[PDB]
C-alpha cells in the first residue's frame, strides 16, 4: 500500500559491479537526504551498510556506495565477492514524520 | 536611501553599516536615561528557527470569514532558538568596549 | 502531543457560533501560553480565556 519499490533480484559474477534501485515518490525519497541501505543474511538481523544516500559507518569500505537523483536512489557494489549474496533493504523518510521500507532485493553471486 | 522598516528591540537587524569604524551615538553620554545607539562597522550573522512542524487549521467564524489557528504538531517537539557565533560576538563586544573606552 | 505533553501550548476547546447564528459547534485549537490567561477565581482550574 505504501512500501517502497525495488527490483526483485539482481545477479552478477565475482569481480563485477551490482546496482540496486530504490524508487518511491516525491514526498518520501525526493524530499530529503534521508535514505539508508541495510544488508540481511538469513537467520539474523539486518546489518547497517549505508546511511544518508552515500555516507558510510564504521567497518564498511568503498565496496559499497550510493547515489540519489529525483525520486529514486541506488546502491552500488564494486568488487563483488561470494560474501555479498544477501537481501538488501531500502529505508527512507516516509513523509509526515514517518520512515518507510520497501520489499528487498535478493543479490545472488554467480 | 532605502530604509528597512525593521521592528526589533535590543538589537538592530539588517541595517546600514558604518564605513570605517564603530560609531557610538547618544544625545549626551553623561545622562543615564539616554539610549546609547552603537553602530557596527561589520555585522554579526544571527540565524533563528522554529523546528516543530506546526500546521494551519481554519475555523469558519460567522458568514464567510475564517480564523486560522494551530492544529496538530506533526513530528516531535523541539526548542525554537537563535544562534550567534561566539568568537565574532566576543570580538564585537571587545570592539564596542574600546570605542566605549574612548569616552570612559 | 502523541503521548507526551508540550510545555508551551494548551489544547483549548471552545464553542464557536457558526455561520448560522442560532447554531453552534465545538472546535479546538492549540494556543501558546502567553496568549492564554486563566478566567477567574472560581472553582475550575480548566477554564481559561484569551489575554484580550
Amino acid at each position, epitope marked *: *500500500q*505504501s*512500501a517502497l519499490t525495488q527490483p526483485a533480484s539482481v545477479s552478477g559474477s565475482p569481480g563485477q559491479s551490482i546496482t540496486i534501485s530504490c524508487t518511491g515518490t516525491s514526498y518520501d525519497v525526493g524530499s530529503y537526504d*534521508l*535514505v*539508508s541501505w*541495510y544488508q540481511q543474511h538469513p537467520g539474523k*538481523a*539486518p546489518k*547497517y551498510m549505508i*546511511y*544518508e544516500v552515500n555516507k558510510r*559507518p564504521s567497518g564498511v569500505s568503498n565496496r559499497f556506495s550510493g547515489s540519489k537523483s529525483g525520486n529514486t536512489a541506488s546502491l552500488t557494489i564494486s568488487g563483488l565477492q561470494a560474501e555479498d549474496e544477501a537481501d538488501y*533493504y531500502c*529505508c*527512507s*523518510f*516516509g513523509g509526515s*514524520a*514517518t*520512515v*518507510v*521500507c*520497501g*520489499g*528487498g532485493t535478493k543479490v545472488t553471486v554467480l | 536611501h532605502g530604509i528597512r522598516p525593521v521592528v526589533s528591540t535590543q538589537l538592530l537587524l539588517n541595517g546600514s553599516l558604518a564605513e570605517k569604524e564603530i560609531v557610538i551615538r547618544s544625545e549626551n553620554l553623561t545622562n543615564n536615561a539616554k539610549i546609547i545607539i552603537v553602530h557596527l562597522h561589520t555585522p554579526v550573522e544571527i540565524v533563528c528557527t522554529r*523546528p*516543530n*512542524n506546526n500546521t494551519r487549521k481554519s475555523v469558519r467564524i460567522g458568514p464567510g470569514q475564517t480564523f486560522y489557528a494551530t492544529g496538530d504538531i506533526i*513530528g*516531535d*517537539i*523541539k*526548542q525554537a*532558538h537563535c544562534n550567534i557565533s561566539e568568537e565574532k560576538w566576543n570580538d564585537t563586544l571587545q570592539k564596542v568596549g574600546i570605542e566605549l573606552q574612548k569616552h570612559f | *502531543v*502523541k*503521548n*507526551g505533553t508540550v510545555e508551551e501550548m494548551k489544547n483549548c476547546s471552545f464553542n464557536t457560533t457558526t455561520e448560522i447564528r442560532d447554531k453552534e459547534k465545538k472546535e479546538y485549537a492549540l494556543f501558546y501560553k502567553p496568549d492564554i490567561v486563566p478566567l477567574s477565581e472560581t472553582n475550575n482550574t480548566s477554564e481559561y480565556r484569551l489575554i484580550n
Partner: nanobody
Amino acid sequence: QVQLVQSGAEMKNPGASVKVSCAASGYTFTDFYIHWVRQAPGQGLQWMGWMNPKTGRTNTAQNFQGRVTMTRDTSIGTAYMELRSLTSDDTAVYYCATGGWISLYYDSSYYPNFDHWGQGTLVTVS
C-alpha cells in the same frame, strides 16, 4: 559494546495483545531514539514506530496507529511495545533498533539511521 537484548519468542491466539521487550546497554538508554520494525517470514521489513525515550513521545505509521503502544522504564533502560488485536497477518519477527540523536534543537526522529539491532522476537498467531 552496544547491544540490544529483547525477550523470548511468544505464541498467542488471535484477538489477544502481545508485549515485546527490549533491554538496552552501553548508551544508558537515553540520547538515542528507538525504532520498532517488523518482518513477516519471507517478506521485507515493515517499520512500525519510534519512541523518544527521554520524554516519552511516541509515533507510529498510519496503518498501525490504533493497535501499537510504546512505553519505557528509564531506571533499568528497557522499552516495551504492545500490539493489540492480533490477526494471522501479525505473526512475524519483531526488531528493536536505535535511531537518531536526541538533540532538543532539531528533529532527529525520522532519520532511518538504525545503528544497533536486537536479536528479534518471533510472535506467532494461531
